[PDB]
Swiss-Prot record:
Phosphate binds at S66, S67, G68, K69, T70, Q186. It comes from the Bacteria. Polymerizes non-specifically on ssDNA to form filaments. Interacts with and activates LexA leading to autocatalytic cleavage of LexA, which derepresses the SOS regulon and activates DNA repair. This is Protein RecA. Keywords: ATP-binding, Cytoplasm, DNA damage, DNA recombination, DNA repair, DNA-binding, Nucleotide-binding, SOS response. ATP binds at S66, S67, G68, K69, T70, T71, D97, P98, E99, Y100. One of its GO terms (molecular function) is damaged DNA binding. It comes from Mycolicibacterium smegmatis (strain ATCC 700084 / mc(2)155). CDD domains: RecA. PANTHER family: MITOCHONDRIAL DNA REPAIR PROTEIN RECA HOMOLOG-RELATED, RECA. Required for homologous recombination (HR) and the bypass of mutagenic DNA lesions (double strand breaks, DSB) by the SOS response. Can catalyze the hydrolysis of ATP in the presence of single-stranded DNA, the ATP-dependent uptake of single-stranded DNA by duplex DNA, and the ATP-dependent hybridization of homologous single-stranded DNAs. Numerous X-ray crystals have been resolved under different conditions which indicate the flexibility of the protein, essential to its function. It is found in: Cytoplasm. The gene is recA. Disruption phenotype: Not essential in the absence of DNA damage, its deletion renders cells much more sensitive to DNA damaging agents such as UV light, ionizing radiation, alkylating agents and DNA gyrase inhibitors and desiccation-induced DSBs. 5-fold decrease in survival, loss of HR, no change in NHEJ (non-homologous end-joining) or single-strand annealing DSB repair. GO terms for biological process: DNA recombination; DNA repair; SOS response.
Length: 308
């Protein structure tokens, strides 16, 4: 009996008994499902190992206030609509700002918003909305907002039960309807289930503010995919979020362009194929915000260096 020859046997046996990736080898680069929703963050896309948030799965995005979570989600919503999709936003926080949303790429006019009254209602109308197999993506702002019917009237019970049940009924559905479900989870609750239901769990934290000059613009966010059942987990990804513009695609190409030698630094003087872009990230960002085919080439070049 041979070791490696006997590991892959059982290993492939466990998958056939529980799932596609119930046992992964962190090293694996394996990729054969595609159908992903770009998050608008290149580093994060590769970080997920499949280019984007899978489709037909529940996804958790947790983190503290002002971390970027909602932005990633809104970003997901855009790329989703852009390629002819329908997005439903079950709001229970009442924090959404259409101005900022549209400025990210979302089609607000055609965005379905619902402001459930009870937490049970939200999960009902959210499931109901999914079962119609028409939605591409659906985001539920605030797991913590989904408060049980009571407590809004006369320790005494549980909410994590409300979540459980809802997920159990809903998991099946969105799975064979190809509708991705983003659950915003702002905190540092009843998610004692979503942790096992989710096939992908994102951990967003605001690494540090972006100097820029006098005052600041946006922040630098770090996302650690602690759970990923489609690809190998524990991957990380950083990216900039300008305040008022959202995630910076441009800023992605650099942080990413240098980690792969496509762009070079001649002493805080970024350059590509001979010609230079500027002196200092913020400056080389602008350079790319003007010439787009130059970026379209670098962007094109990195999607070729890795899974596509
Ligand atoms: N209304 C807005 N106007 C301008 N900039 C905004 C606005 N809302 C958010 N931003 C920018 C700056 C914020 O630091 C950044 C992150 O936004 P947000 O999507 O609010 O992150 P988040 O999901 O961690 O926060 P929250 O837990 O409140 O949902 O987006």
């Amino acid at each position: 009996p041979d070791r490696e020859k006997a590991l892959e046997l059982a290993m492939a046996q466990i998958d056939k008994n529980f799932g596609k990736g119930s046992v992964m080898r962190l090293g694996e680069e394996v990729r054969q499902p595609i159908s992903v929703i770009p998050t608008g963050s290149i580093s994060l896309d590769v970080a997920l190992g499949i280019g984007g948030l899978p489709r037909g799965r529940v996804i958790e995005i947790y983190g503290p206030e002002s971390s970027g979570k909602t932005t990633v989600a809104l970003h997901a919503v855009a790329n989703a609509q852009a390629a002819g999709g329908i997005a439903a936003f079950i709001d229970a926080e009442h924090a959404l700002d259409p101005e900022y949303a549209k400025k990210l790429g979302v089609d607000t006019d055609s965005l379905l918003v619902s402001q459930p009254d009870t937490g049970e209602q939200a999960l009902e109308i959210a499931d109901m909305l999914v079962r119609s197999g028409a939605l591409d993506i659906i985001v539920i702002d605030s797991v913590a907002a989904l408060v049980p019917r009571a407590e809004i009237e006369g320790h005494v019970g549980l909410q994590a039960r409300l979540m459980s049940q809802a997920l159990r009924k809903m998991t099946g559905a969105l799975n064979n309807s190809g509708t991705t479900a983003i659950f915003i989870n702002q905190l540092r609750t009843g998610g004692k289930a979503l942790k096992f239901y989710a096939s992908v769990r994102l951990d967003v934290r605001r690494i540090e503010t972006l100097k820029d000059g006098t005052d600041a613009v946006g922040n630098r966010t770090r996302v650690k995919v602690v759970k990923n059942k489609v690809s190998p987990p524990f991957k990380q990804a950083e990216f900039d979020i300008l305040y008022g513009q959202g995630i910076s695609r441009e800023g992605s190409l650099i942080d990413m362009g240098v980690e792969h030698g496509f762009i070079r630094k001649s002493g805080s003087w970024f350059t590509y194929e001979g010609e230079q872009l500027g002196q200092g990230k913020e400056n080389a960002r602008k350079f790319l915000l003007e010439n787009t085919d130059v970026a379209n080439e670098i962007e094109k070049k990195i999607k070729e260096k890795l899974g596509i």
